Amino acid sequence: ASKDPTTFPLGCSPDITTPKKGLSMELYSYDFRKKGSYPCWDAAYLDPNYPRTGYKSHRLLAKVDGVTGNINFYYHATKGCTPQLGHLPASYNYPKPLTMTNFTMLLYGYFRPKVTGFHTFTISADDLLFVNFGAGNAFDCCRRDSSADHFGNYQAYAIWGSKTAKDELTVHLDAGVYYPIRLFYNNREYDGALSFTFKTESNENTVSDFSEYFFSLDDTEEGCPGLI
Amino acid sequence: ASKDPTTFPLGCSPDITTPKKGLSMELYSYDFRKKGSYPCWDAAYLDPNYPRTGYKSHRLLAKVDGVTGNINFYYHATKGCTPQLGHLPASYNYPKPLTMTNFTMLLYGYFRPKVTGFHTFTISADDLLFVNFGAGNAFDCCRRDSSADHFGNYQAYAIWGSKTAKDELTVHLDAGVYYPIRLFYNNREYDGALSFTFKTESNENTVSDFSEYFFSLDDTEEGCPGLI
Ligand SMILES: OC[C@H]1O[C@@H](O[C@@H]2[C@@H](O)[C@H](O)O[C@H](CO)[C@H]2O)[C@H](O)[C@@H](O)[C@H]1O
Ligand SMILES: OC[C@H]1O[C@@H](O[C@@H]2[C@@H](O)[C@H](O)O[C@H](CO)[C@H]2O)[C@H](O)[C@@H](O)[C@H]1O
Numbered sequence: 001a002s003k004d005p006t007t008f009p010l011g012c013s014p015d016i017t018t019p020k021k022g023l024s025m026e027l028y029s030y031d032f033r034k035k036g037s038y039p040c041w042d043a044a045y046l047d048p049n050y051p052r053t054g055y056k057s058h059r060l061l062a063k064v065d066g067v068t069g070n071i072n073f074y075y076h077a078t079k080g081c082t083p084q085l086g087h088l089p090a091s092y093n094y095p096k097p098l099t100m101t102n103f104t105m106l107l108y109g110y111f112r113p114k115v116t117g118f119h120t121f122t123i124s125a126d127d128l129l130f131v132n133f134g135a136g137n138a139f140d141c142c143r144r145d146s147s148a149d150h151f152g153n154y155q156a157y158a159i160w161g162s163k164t165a166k167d168e169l170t171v172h173l174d175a176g177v178y179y180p181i182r183l184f185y186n187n188r189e190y191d192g193a194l195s196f197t198f199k200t201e202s203n204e205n206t207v208s209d210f211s212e213y214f215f216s217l218d219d220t221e222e223g224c225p226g227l228i
Numbered sequence: 229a230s231k232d233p234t235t236f237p238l239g240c241s242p243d244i245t246t247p248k249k250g251l252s253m254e255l256y257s258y259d260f261r262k263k264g265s266y267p268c269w270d271a272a273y274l275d276p277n278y279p280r281t282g283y284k285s286h287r288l289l290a291k292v293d294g295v296t297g298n299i300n301f302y303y304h305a306t307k308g309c310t311p312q313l314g315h316l317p318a319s320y321n322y323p324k325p326l327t328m329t330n331f332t333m334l335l336y337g338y339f340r341p342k343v344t345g346f347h348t349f350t351i352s353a354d355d356l357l358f359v360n361f362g363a364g365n366a367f368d369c370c371r372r373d374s375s376a377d378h379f380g381n382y383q384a385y386a387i388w389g390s391k392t393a394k395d396e397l398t399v400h401l402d403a404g405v406y407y408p409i410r411l412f413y414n415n416r417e418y419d420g421a422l423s424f425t426f427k428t429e430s431n432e433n434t435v436s437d438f439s440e441y442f443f444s445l446d447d448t449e450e451g452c453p454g455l456i
């Protein structure tokens with residue numbers, strides 16, 4: 001599939017193997033600059049290659065499966081220029097403290113719609129959330145390991161301190177198809193926040209709980225391109 | 229031509245009209261944040277879309293032709309968090325002061341090699357220099373106006389404060405062919421610097437003076453794709 005972002009993204013059609021609930025998550029450290037630096041926080045997170053290759057040089061903290069439910073969070077820090085401990089919501093399946101002031105997080109898997117039609121995803125983040133969505137754009141169908149670092153232009157992105165740290169993605173999706181998704185998050189300092197929600201044309205409900213929507217599929221020999 | 233960066237970029241073959249010496253330049257303001265902000269400088273320059281669309285919202289200062297010769301500069305500021313006046317080198321054909329502490333600059337045109345073989349361009353910048361090179365990657369042959377905002381992934385980039393603010397691009401080029409080039413520069417605060425030089429396989433000379441190398445070509449009805 002083409003890597004470019006689109007309004008009609010391509011999805012995937014898994015075989016008999018039952019999809020596993022939730023996304024996969026990788027957590028990495030994100031250090032501050034040396035004491036006395038102005039500003040204290042490292043601007044590495046905004047290097048164009050940070051979400052592709054740059055994060056990989058940082059300390060791997062965790063890799064977990066099964067991230068689902070409501071993945072939103074708001075971490076309130078008390079001090080700038082200071083690593084401070086906190087916890088992710090239970091939805092993240094990570095029961096250890098981390099430096100919630102300063103860290104990098106990657107989430108990936110598939111989004112399965114319940115309805116056919118236009119979906120508008122709304123995102124916000126402190127400091128950064130970059131979203132890829134669709135086969136090619138995020139990764140290839142049941143061939144994630146091969147294509148994981150070849151994601152395309154972002155479908156939506158939010159950067160704190162921009163005119164607004166909020167963005168939308170509107171895409172037409174088909175019910176029961178599995179769409180590759182990649183979420184890339186960073187906190188540089190102080191408070192951290194992630195909001196990821198959506199609405200559809202079918203009703204006025206806002207979805208914040210992704211229990212019925214986020215899944216992981218095993219890679220397969222032949223891949224699982226969308227058949228619909 | 230494909231927009232992707234490559235080791236064998238595509239070039240252009242202009243018609244009888246004599247190429248004009250030098251690149252075109254556009255200068256834009258780049259404001260500081262409101263007094264008392266930490267840090268003082270705006271991080272807008274690192275938004276992923278800043279070099280494509282974001283700069284356009286800023287005040288247009290100048291558009292000039294004929295930029296050639298040695299385009300390197302180093303502007304020494306005396307104060308942080310403060311717009312300070314300075315001048316670009318004469319090569320820039322811009323005889324007015326500007327806020328050299330804080331500004332955005334776009335250069336574009338064509339690079340014409342003197343020798344056939346591998347060229348290694350070395351760049352450095354305070355704060356930012358992004359380079360596109362080749363038909364498609366920078367823009368289309370004698371169709372710049374149509375394709376100017378559709379440049380591809382950068383062939384080289386330098387960001388001050390990164391592990392090094394220096395980068396190289398090694399490309400095999402053909403003598404007398406005209407290769408689209410785009411240079412995108414920003415200073416966020418304080419000192420500003422740009423260095424753009426190259427070497428080839430033919431000798432050990434470093435080229436810093438682009439008098440015989442940078443040109444502008446008029447757009448034409450049919451374009452001027454490389455014929456070699
Ligand atoms: O307000 C959320 C943002 O906070 C930013 O951190 C600043 C810190 O740089 C400054 O020195 O202190 C204030 C608190 O007095 C604090 O807001 C942070 O850089 C940014 O990531 C946001 O989280
Ligand atoms: O050293 C070149 C870099 O300077 C950076 O500006 C800092 C300023 O943020 C700090 O407060 O003061 C020092 C001088 O004491 C100054 O170096 C600038 O942000 C960066 O763009 C480079 O030019």
Ligand SMILES: [Ca+2]
Nearest residue numbers: 188189190191
């Ligand atoms: Ca933050």
Ligand SMILES: [Ca+2]
Nearest residue numbers: 416417418419
């Ligand atoms: Ca600077």
